[PDB]
Ligand binder design. Structure first.
Ligand code: CU
Ligand code: CU
Ligand code: CU
Ligand code: CU
Ligand code: CU
Ligand code: CU
Lengths: 341, 341, 341
């Protein structure tokens, strides 16, 4: 029975940015059309230049954020070009049936498939490849995961009948990676994903990542690729982790409104210091910036954040508020008449 | 001062099934009588036939689910037959005082003990052995843990004054296991729990399980022992983990109503993709099946799920709903006029 | 523009105790003055006498609990005596701007600094050192972390308009430690923090602690330093973990009211068995003791609790309530007419 709704083609953009969308809408349900192209390729994952045999949707880790509204249909064309070596598929945690779509989307290199799923559940959700068996974790931790956001048609709210609107949105995909080392402790390089598999599975089995990165590599979202904001802006930070827990924290800020389980039918928690993304999920936090300067956005296992790659920066423009915080006395020599024992 | 209430003897059944019970009841408080018999025995824990020196309540991992109502008394006869080698006891996280009952239930082989605890707290709760000191984790990770459910007398509700009723209930006990390996990486076998202890403690200390299983072994709840359901049924899935965190996910479904901390005085969260069972607790999720087919129920560390044992299946009978999901175009060769870069 | 409020100097006390404070107050906002003195020193961390090159605020792990009210200003003098070897600073997760204060408080040995932050966010919050880069995790896991509590001016409430008042408060700071071992597996000793660093970083990178302790050492809060309470007392247990997740559980009790994300703008959950402190946060639980005796307070990874150091005790005075729990029959030989198969 043909589905007779308007169609809208969406052009995806690379994370941490997000394709243009409306928050609140008075449009009715549409068939929202997306295309994802699998790309297997070697990628650089850390500041020392370590390479990795990655597998991606659309060439990025994470895959791009898709945004629709409650009641829309999502029609995804998944493409597996013949330059790839592996079969792939896609599982939407937002979707109902057939293992999230994985049981309807298995494609060999040289094939494509078209899946439609109804967006009946609001929130942010993981999507990931899941070919079967041990290939499921391997494809996911090789980079084959992203997220989809299903907004209420009226946009976000605080769970107490007040509208919430973001000025800016960023998507932070966190990736646990498992890179083999040689006898001397150096990371090993491989010429194909298949050649990396056996050694990689051994590292995976011990459940300790070698790297934990945002946007696919250590330092991806620092330096010149820091995330911009301004004092007074309400920023939505979507965070996903398809395989392993995370504990996001905005250093020098808070989560004003946090859906740590990621589902907008639940009221957000207020005023959090650190929240928790359970592996296999996406969550989201709103924050209104109150101070200018550099903020570091981390997982608050600080070892992961500082030493395995999992730090992003915000650079926030505006005027400093000395009522909220001030340096009363700059560093000075301890007074000779001090005690301090 | 004798307690003058009606007595009801309950016959426990092996997980993942649950003894017969009422959800809502107009019966008053009763003394609900249960018996648990400790059994130390070698068990098979994975598809390659690895054996393990297990210690169990009632011969199963997990121990059986006990179900009572708020205000009932629970009178447990704990039996430690003289064929066992170790002292054992029982700690109910549902109970108040004496380390959950552990300080009143320590029995040598050849002894039994009778503990009564009042079910003053609603929810699902862990029970476990806890003899003292380093024996506490060892007995728990050797299999000596289960769960108890204390239902409100009016049954479950959504926290907004609407009754919730399940058509079916399953109990998923997740077990982290720590099996020693020899110099070549093969799992070691032992002739007794005591002989396994020193080598097992060394693996335990590094906090990385070798196996993470549902119902005591990899593949326990797949193949012919898949969990049955039908389209339209509301299924309650109780999940426990006595020692280590888990992140349950129903692949192709959701948690319609989830008590991830497991306590029915709190309203459930709605529409979750993945939830979180903190180690040392039980949680519960309701889901109404909307699509037929195979569903995989996992912890969403996919390495744990696919490679360490932690996958169950549901086989759901009914009619496919093409409005919720459909394969618009089956796999086909990428059109020659396609781009895809 | 000078801030013209009354000033109040607070004398901090060593954990697990808490400086005197009011729960509800009709005082207006004050500038609450605190001093923290960094101390680098070797400390004993386990029952076998293992030593560790620690770095602390005020000589303790955790640093002391600071207590203020919503709307107060907190003026902290941070002192780094010239006997220390390292630069230090302080990041308050309760504060807004400048990386929580870290970007305004970096002091060399022989210096001090004065930071003021407005207590605009209610809850319990971590504070920690964060000098920069890989020094951030190293200083934190060397002991440089504590917590601050920002109470509502009306004190705590249940989120349903009922006041909650504690009779007693304890602060449990949990510390993950990473102690190097030699080729034979023995813990290594060092003459300075700098000399320990390279070997310690290698252990940190594998993300598995060697020790997980409360109040700075295994057994700190057992034996003669057990935590006292009485039947009928409502006890607030503040728990922090600056780097790694924890799952607190009171063995033989419950969490009557739990803010596991730690922020008093959110209603607490009721009747929990086990709760979850996400690494980089503090949470809090109220419990009214109903039974006398020993209680063990653990992280419910029981391996961590029994074998890596993470057990505290409460010793509770009062009268046993046989209605809540009783030993119906003491241990006895299994009756000859028993079956039990
Ligand atoms: Cu794939
Ligand atoms: Cu998934
Ligand atoms: Cu036992
Ligand atoms: Cu327990
Ligand atoms: Cu420091
Ligand atoms: Cu921090």
């Amino acid at each position: 029975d043909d589905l007779k709704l308007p169609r809208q083609r969406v052009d995806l953009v690379a994370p941490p940015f997000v394709h243009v969308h409306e928050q609140a809408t008075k449009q009715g349900p549409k068939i929202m059309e997306f295309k994802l192209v699998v790309q297997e390729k070697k990628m650089v994952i850390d500041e020392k230049g370590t390479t990795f045999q990655a597998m991606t949707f659309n060439g990025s880790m994470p895959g791009p954020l898709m945004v629709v509204h409650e009641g829309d249909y999502v029609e995804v064309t998944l493409v597996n070009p013949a330059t790839n070596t592996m079969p792939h598929n896609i599982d939407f945690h937002s979707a109902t049936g057939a293992l999230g779509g994985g049981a309807l989307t298995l494609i060999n290199p040289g094939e494509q498939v078209v899946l439609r799923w109804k967006a009946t559940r609001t929130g942010v959700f993981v999507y990931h490849c899941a070919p079967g068996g041990p290939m499921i974790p391997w494809h996911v931790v090789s980079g084959m995961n992203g997220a989809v956001m299903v907004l209420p048609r009226d946009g976000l709210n605080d769970g107490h009948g007040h509208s919430l609107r973001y000025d800016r949105i960023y998507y932070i995909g966190e990736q646990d990676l498992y890179v083999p080392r040689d006898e001397k402790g150096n990371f090993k390089s491989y010429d194909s994903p298949g050649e990396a598999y056996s050694d990689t599975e051994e590292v995976m089995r011990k459940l300790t990542p070698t790297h934990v990165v945002f946007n696919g590599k250590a330092g991806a979202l620092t330096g010149k690729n820091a995330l911009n904001a301004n004092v007074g802006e309400n920023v939505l930070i979507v965070h996903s982790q398809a395989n392993r827990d995370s504990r996001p924290h905005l250093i020098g800020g808070h989560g004003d409104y946090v859906w740590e389980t990621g589902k907008f039918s639940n009221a957000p928690e207020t005023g959090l210091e650190t929240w928790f993304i359970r592996g296999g999920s996406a969550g989201a936090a709103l924050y209104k910036f109150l101070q200018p300067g550099i903020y570091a956005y981390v997982t608050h296992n600080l070892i992961e954040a500082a030493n395995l790659g999992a730090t992003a920066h915000f650079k926030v423009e505006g005027k400093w508020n000395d009522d909220l915080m001030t340096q009363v006395k700059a560093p000075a020599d301890i007074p000779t008449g001090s005690t301090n024992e």
